[PDB]
Amino acid sequence: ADINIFSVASGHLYERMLNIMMVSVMKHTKHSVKFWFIEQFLSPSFKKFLPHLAKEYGFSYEMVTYKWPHWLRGQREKQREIWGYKILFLDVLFPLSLDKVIFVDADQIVRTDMYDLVQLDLEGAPYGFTPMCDSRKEMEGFRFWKQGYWKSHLRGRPYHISALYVVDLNRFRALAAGDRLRGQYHTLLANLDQDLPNNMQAMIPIKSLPQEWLWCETWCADEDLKTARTIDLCNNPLTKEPKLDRARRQVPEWTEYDNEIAELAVR
């Protein structure tokens, strides 16, 4: 497929949002699309519905199986285990033939042709992430990456949000980036999937994507929603507003797509 996207949904609401994310992709491209899912994180309900969604929305899909390695420190907390599956296994989840994959959070709405991201030149970096927004000024106290350890550590590199990233799997494998990330994970990560790649940039470069690639209201100004290519419903450490409430109000298409999926289910 032209576009290859990987995501995870563990939890009822994340599954509901993942179906919507997938629909949002298909509304904005006429390229071929394949979704990749990790077997362990597929529930019976989701697995049952998935082929219907595929026959309606015109995507293909494949499951990968990868057991957390015995020698690799585990995560007792499910949420952190999931975040680990996002980042620790990029060289081993997928077939060797797969050239490139894009990770998109389940709680996203896409508003762009994701082939644009497939075509985007990473300029030798094995993966690309969007910088955190600076624009919403009221949230400065929560921008921990501008404080203490991170300002010094980053040496002028951005701190990037891990909701969306494109991985040149060939370059990533050639650089042995997976072994390096797993080695650093052992050595050291409150934000496991985000702190790790941002910490390792000198060793494993990030291509900083243009800012429009990922908008989250937590960090980003209202005025920049209109030019956002994708939207993430990232948790807001100030308001603690429930994600479902945010999904209903943020952009009109979330409810549009949820309703469309509901009508598919009636059939």
Ligand X SMILES: O=c1ccn([C@@H]2O[C@H](COP(=O)(O)OP(=O)(O)O)[C@@H](O)[C@H]2O)c(=O)[nH]1
Q: Among residue numbers 54 through 93, which ones bind ligand X (CB under 6 A)? A: 79, 82
Q: What Cα–Cα distance (Å) separates residue 78 from each residue in 12, 85, 89, 94, 177?
A: 14, 11, 17, 22, 25
Which residues neighbour 245 within 8 Å (Cβ) at sequence distance 6 or greater?
Answer: none
Instruction: Determine whether 96 is exposed, middle or buried from the number of CB atoms within 10 Å of its CB (0-12, 13-18, 19+).
Output: exposed
Looking at the Cβ atoms of 26 and 247, the one nearer to ligand X is 247
Looking at the Cβ atoms of 204 and 234, the one nearer to Ca ion is 234
Looking at the Cβ atoms of 105 and 168, the one nearer to ligand X is 105
For residue 195, state whether it binds ligand X (rule: CB under 6 A): no
Which residues neighbour 194 within 8 Å (Cβ) at sequence distance 6 or greater?
Answer: 160, 161, 162
CA separation for the pair 96, 64 (Å, rounded): 12
Q: Among 97, 125, 96, 133, which Cα is nearest to 212's?
A: 133
Binding residues for Ca ion, rule: CB under 5 A, are 105, 107, 163, 232, 234
CA separation for the pair 145, 164 (Å, rounded): 18
Q: Among residue numbers 9 through 28, which ones bind ligand X (CB under 6 A)? A: 9-11, 14
For residue 168, state whether it binds ligand X (rule: CB under 6 A): no
Looking at the Cβ atoms of 5 and 177, the one nearer to ligand X is 5
Minimum Å distance from CB 80 to ligand X? 9
Contact with ligand X (CB under 6 A) among 8, 88, 102, 132: 8
165 binds, among ligand X, Ca ion, none (CB under 5 to 8 A by kind): none
Q: Among residue numbers 228 through 247, which ones bind ligand X (CB under 6 A)? A: 232, 234-235
For residue 7, state whether it binds ligand X (rule: CB under 6 A): yes
CA separation for the pair 125, 201 (Å, rounded): 10
CA separation for the pair 161, 197 (Å, rounded): 10
Contact with ligand X (CB under 6 A) among 5, 53, 101, 106: 106
For residue 105, state whether it binds ligand X (rule: CB under 6 A): yes
- Positions touching ligand X (CB under 6 A) are 7-11, 14, 79, 82, 105-107, 163, 232, 234-235
